[PDB]
Design an enzyme around this catalytic site. Sequence first.
Site, mmCIF file in Angstrom:
data_model
loop_
_atom_site.group_PDB
_atom_site.id
_atom_site.type_symbol
_atom_site.label_atom_id
_atom_site.label_comp_id
_atom_site.label_asym_id
_atom_site.label_seq_id
_atom_site.Cartn_x
_atom_site.Cartn_y
_atom_site.Cartn_z
ATOM 1 N N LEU A 25 -54.022 28.575 16.288
ATOM 2 C CA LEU A 25 -53.933 27.129 16.465
ATOM 3 C C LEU A 25 -54.170 26.736 17.912
ATOM 4 C CD1 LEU A 25 -50.853 26.101 14.298
ATOM 5 C CD2 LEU A 25 -53.286 25.840 13.770
ATOM 6 N N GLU A 32 -43.382 20.440 14.886
ATOM 7 C CA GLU A 32 -44.318 20.395 13.767
ATOM 8 C C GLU A 32 -43.999 21.567 12.833
ATOM 9 O OE1 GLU A 32 -46.960 21.974 12.093
ATOM 10 O OE2 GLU A 32 -46.953 20.107 10.945
#
Length: 206
Positions: A25, A32
Amino acid sequence: MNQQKSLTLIVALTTSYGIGRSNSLPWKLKKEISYFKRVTSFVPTFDSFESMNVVLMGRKTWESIPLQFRPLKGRINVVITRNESLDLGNGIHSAKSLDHALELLYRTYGSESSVQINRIFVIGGAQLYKAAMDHPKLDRIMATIIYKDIHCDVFFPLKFRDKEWSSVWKKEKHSDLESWVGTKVPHGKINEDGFDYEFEMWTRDL
Ligand SMILES: NC(=O)C1=CN([C@@H]2O[C@H](COP(=O)(O)OP(=O)(O)OC[C@H]3O[C@@H](n4cnc5c(N)ncnc54)[C@H](OP(=O)(O)O)[C@@H]3O)[C@@H](O)[C@H]2O)C=CC1
Ligand SMILES: COc1ccc(OCCCCC(=O)O)cc1Cc1cnc(N)nc1N
């Protein structure tokens, strides 16, 4: 007896549908991930006694996740891998396709099973995402929209938030999102690491 359950997809993506970089990522939002965990782990208290959700993920995503957090605790893990050599996901279920994963679950967790399935999630891989979006049982998307065109090399397979798909995919109200999830969920924009993002839930009729 291999489809009596809809599939939900969960993912974090940029406004240009970017979902990943070099097998990882391009961002880092601890909050999150906390949301991810809550959503995929939550099961109504009454049912929580003997029921657990399932997280389906591609082999690449399974490897891209830190060992300390693998396997996803409190949830049934199943790794999709098309050439079935060997895994290792401690009693971790292995399947060569999305439907093959479903059948294995329905056979491993039936009526005589002390552990019952609650919800089935798709959480890993752009490749697995492609299969899910084409699956006739996929009707819900837990999406975390990131308002930043971060450089990515991997993208989400279908533009569900775009006009061309506005007659099939619809964005639910926050209240309905919190209701489906089970608990209260942060509403509005969130700023974590110079990035602005928010939680949305989208659905389509089967
Ligand atoms: N932004 C987000 O929320 C998320 C982003 N990501 C990102 O996605 C990127 C990786 O993407 P991607 O490579 O596609 O990951 P996948 O996890 O989907 O890796 C694909 C591999 O998984 C297996 N696989 C996937 N779909 C199928 C299928 N339909 N049938 C049989 N096997 C299948 C195969 O295994 P084998 O090769 O063993 O046969 C295939 O090589 C990364 O940047 C990662 O972080 C991942 C999850 C969430
Ligand atoms: C590749 O994206 C992820 C990176 C880490 C991750 O954490 C899993 C273990 C720690 C938390 C837990 O116990 O559940 C999960 C993902 C997948 C992911 C994240 N966020 C969103 N919105 N969708 C996903 N599929």
